[PDB]
C-alpha cells in the first residue's frame, strides 16, 4: 500500500483541464500505456480551457501564479512565479529576450488584457480584487489589489490593459524603480496576429506496454531475427530491435528529444483534446522530462493516468519512484529514467536520485577492463601493471561460451584470484595516491565477493594461501584445479 491520491481528488491537484484529462483516459486504454504528467500551473487551467495558446520550447520564460498576470508568461520575469529570486528572474528575462529576437516574427510580446470574465475568475481564486477608480491624464483606471509588497497594478477602463509600477520606497529584485507602465506578456504569431501564451502540459514520462512496442516493429524485420539459428546473435538481434523501435530517442527541431512512438502519442494526445473542442492548437508540445538531461526538474507530485483509465497522483518523489517500480518497470512495460539522475546535471547542477538496479549489483560483480580504466580517468581528476586491466578483460571473455557452467565457474574463479593478485602487490608498493588506495581496497572487496559467490555456487582467503604467484604460467593454474575439490 502506498498513500497516493485517486480520481477527482487527483485530477484537482493536477492542473489539467478535467475535460482534457478525460479525453486522455481513452488513449491510455487504447494504447495500453501509462501517461505521467508534471504539475500544471493551477492558475493556467482556465486559460487553457478557454482556448489560450500553450507554449513550446522556443519560450522558456516561466508562467505567473499570482497577480493580474497569473497564468500568462510575463515578459518581465519578476512578475512570474520566480518573483523575488534574482538569478532566476535574470535567466528568465534573458530567455524572453532571446525568444523575442532569435525567433523574431514567431514570438512577440503584447499588453496584457484582462477581460470581464477573467477578472471574476481571479476574484474567485482570491488572486486580485477590483479596487477604487482613478483618473490619470484623462483616462479611467480601477486599481487591482494583491497582497504583493513590491508592485501595484491598475487596469484601463477603455481597452482593459493592465499596468504596473513599483511602490513608494520599494525596489525591484533587479534594483529598479519606475512608474506606471503596461504589463507585457509573451505571445506567438497566429495568422499575422500576436496571441498570448499560457502553460502547456508537460509529460513527465510515458510507459507503453512491450506488446504495444511490438506493433512498432515491421513484421518482417522481426521475422529475420526470430529465425536466427545461432542464439547469441538472435538475442543481440532481439535486443537491438527493442532499442531501435522503443528505447532510442533523437533530437527534433521543436519537440526536443523524443522517440518515434512518443511522437505518435504526442499527436494522438493533441487530437484527443481537439475532438473535445480546444481551439488553441497543441496542448502537449514536446518530449518527456526523462530526456531533460541538462536542466532536470524534480516535482513532488506526478499526475498519472494508467492503461485502465484511472487517475493517480503521487505525493512525493519517493512515492513516484515506488509507483513506477511496482506497476511499470517491474510489470512488462517499456521504461527508462533520465540519464542525469544519480549524477550532477550539467545545466542546473541538479542531483536527483533514482533507484538503479545495475548499481545494487556493483558490490558483487567485478569490473570490466573499460570500467577499470574509465575509473582511472575520472579518478585522475582530483590529481605500471596493465596485467590487471588484462585479467579483467580475460574474466569477461565471450569465448567462455563453449564450456560448461562447471568449467566457466572454475576458470572465472581463477581469472579473478589472478586479478586479486596484481592489485595486491600494487598496494604492496607505494600508496601512490592517498585516494587510489581506496579504489583498490575496494576492487579487492568486489573481486572477493564475486569469487566467493561462484564458489558457493558449487562447493576465499582460506584458499588464497595454497596457490602460486611464484612463476607465471599454467603452472599456477595446476595446483588450483585440485584445490577446488
Amino acid at each position: 500500500r502506498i498513500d497516493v491520491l485517486k480520481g477527482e481528488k487527483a485530477l484537482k491537484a493536477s492542473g489539467l483541464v478535467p475535460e482534457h484529462a478525460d479525453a486522455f483516459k481513452k488513449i491510455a486504454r487504447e494504447l495500453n500505456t501509462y501517461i505521467l504528467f508534471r504539475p500544471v500551473n493551477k492558475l493556467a487551467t482556465n486559460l487553457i480551457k478557454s482556448g489560450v495558446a500553450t507554449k513550446g520550447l522556443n519560450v522558456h520564460g516561466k508562467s505567473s501564479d499570482w497577480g493580474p498576470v497569473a497564468g500568462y508568461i510575463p515578459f518581465d520575469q519578476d512578475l512570474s512565479k520566480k518573483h523575488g529570486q534574482q538569478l532566476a528572474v535574470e535567466k528568465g528575462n534573458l530567455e524572453n529576450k532571446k525568444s523575442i529576437t532569435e525567433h523574431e516574427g514567431e514570438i512577440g510580446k503584447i499588453p496584457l488584457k484582462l477581460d470581464h470574465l477573467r477578472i471574476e475568475e481571479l476574484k474567485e481564486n482570491g488572486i486580485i480584487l477590483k479596487g477604487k477608480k482613478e483618473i490619470d491624464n484623462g483616462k479611467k483606471y480601477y486599481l487591482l489589489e494583491s497582497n504583493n509588497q513590491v508592485y501595484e497594478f491598475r487596469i484601463s477602463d477603455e481597452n482593459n490593459e493592465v499596468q504596473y509600477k513599483t511602490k513608494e520606497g520599494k525596489i525591484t529584485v533587479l534594483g529598479e524603480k519606475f512608474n506606471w507602465r503596461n504589463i507585457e506578456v509573451m505571445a506567438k504569431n497566429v495568422e499575422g496576429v500576436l496571441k498570448p501564451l499560457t502553460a502547456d502540459y508537460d509529460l513527465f514520462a510515458l510507459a507503453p506496454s512491450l506488446t504495444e512496442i511490438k506493433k512498432q516493429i515491421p513484421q518482417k524485420e522481426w521475422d529475420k531475427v526470430v529465425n536466427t539459428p545461432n542464439s547469441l546473435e538472435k538475442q543481440k538481434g532481439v535486443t537491438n530491435l527493442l532499442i531501435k523501435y522503443g528505447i532510442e530517442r533523437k533530437p527534433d527541431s521543436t519537440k526536443g528529444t523524443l522517440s518515434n512512438w512518443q511522437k505518435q502519442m504526442l499527436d494522438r494526445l493533441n487530437e484527443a483534446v481537439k475532438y473535445t473542442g480546444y481551439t488553441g492548437g497543441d496542448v502537449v508540445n514536446h518530449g518527456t522530462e526523462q530526456d531533460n538531461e541538462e536542466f532536470p526538474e524534480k516535482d513532488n507530485e506526478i499526475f498519472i493516468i494508467n492503461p485502465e483509465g484511472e487517475f493517480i497522483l503521487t505525493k512525493n518523489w519517493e512515492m513516484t519512484g515506488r509507483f513506477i517500480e511496482k506497476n511499470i518497470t517491474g510489470k512488462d512495460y517499456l521504461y527508462y529514467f533520465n540519464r542525469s539522475y544519480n549524477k550532477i546535471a550539467p545545466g542546473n547542477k541538479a542531483y536527483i536520485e533514482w533507484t538503479d538496479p545495475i548499481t545494487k549489483a556493483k558490490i558483487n560483480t567485478i569490473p570490466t577492463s573499460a570500467e577499470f580504466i574509465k575509473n582511472l580517468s575520472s579518478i585522475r581528476r582530483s590529481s605500471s601493471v596493465k596485467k590487471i586491466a588484462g585479467y579483467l578483460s580475460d574474466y569477461y571473455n565471450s569465448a567462455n561460451h563453449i564450456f560448461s557452467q562447471e568449467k566457466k565457474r572454475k576458470i572465472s574463479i581463477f581469472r579473478g584470484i589472478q586479478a586479486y593478485n596484481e592489485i595486491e602487490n600494487v598496494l604492496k608498493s607505494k600508496q601512490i595516491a592517498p585516494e587510489y588506495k581506496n579504489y583498490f581496497q575496494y576492487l579487492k572487496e568486489r573481486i572477493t565477493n564475486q569469487v566467493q559467490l561462484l564458489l558457493t555456487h558449487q562447493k576465499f582467503k582460506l584458499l588464497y594461501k595454497q596457490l602460486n604467484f611464484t612463476e607465471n604460467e599454467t603452472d599456477n593454474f595446476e595446483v588450483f584445479q585440485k584445490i577446488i575439490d
Binding site: 512491450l210 517491474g330 521504461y335 569477461y396
Partner: protein
C-alpha cells in the same frame, strides 16, 4: 568529452615501453581491447595505413586519439543498451534471469520453451552463475 580524451590517453600510457607516447601497431590492438573494443586484424590494418601512412609504425596520441574519433560514433549506443538491460531485469536485482527473458520474449511475440530460454541465458552467461549481469549483457550486445 574531456574524459573521452582522458580515457584513451589514460590507457595509452599503461603499455608504452617508449615513454614518448608513440607505441607500435603491435600493441595498437592490445590497447583498443584493454579499453573496450575487439578490432579485427583487417581493421587494425587499413586504418594503420590511411591515417598512419607515415612509414614507421609509431602511434602517438594525436594519431590514436583521432582514430577513436570515429569508431566511438555509432557504437556509443551504450546508453540504450544499458537502458535495455534495465527493461529485462523486472525485479531490479541487477541481473537478467531466464524467467525474465521469457517474459520480454513472449510479450514481443516469439514464444519460447523453458528449454530454449535457459539455452539463451547460458550462452550469454560468462562466469557461469546462471544469470546475466550488465557487464555480460554488454559483451553479448557488442562483442
Amino acid at each position: 568529452t574531456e574524459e573521452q580524451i582522458a580515457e584513451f590517453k589514460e590507457a595509452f600510457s599503461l603499455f608504452d615501453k617508449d615513454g614518448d607516447g608513440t607505441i607500435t601497431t603491435k600493441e595498437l590492438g592490445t590497447v583498443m581491447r584493454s579499453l573496450g573494443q575487439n578490432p579485427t586484424e583487417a581493421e587494425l590494418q587499413d586504418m594503420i595505413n590511411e591515417v598512419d601512412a607515415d612509414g614507421n609504425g609509431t602511434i602517438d596520441f594525436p594519431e590514436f586519439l583521432t582514430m577513436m574519433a570515429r569508431k566511438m560514433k555509432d557504437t556509443d549506443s551504450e546508453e540504450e543498451i544499458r537502458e535495455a538491460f534495465r527493461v529485462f531485469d523486472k525485479d531490479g536485482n541487477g541481473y537478467i534471469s531466464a524467467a525474465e527473458l521469457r517474459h520480454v520474449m513472449t510479450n514481443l511475440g516469439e514464444k519460447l520453451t523453458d528449454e530454449e530460454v535457459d539455452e539463451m541465458i547460458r550462452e550469454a552467461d560468462i562466469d557461469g552463475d546462471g544469470q546475466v549481469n550488465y557487464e555480460e549483457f554488454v559483451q553479448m550486445m557488442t562483442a
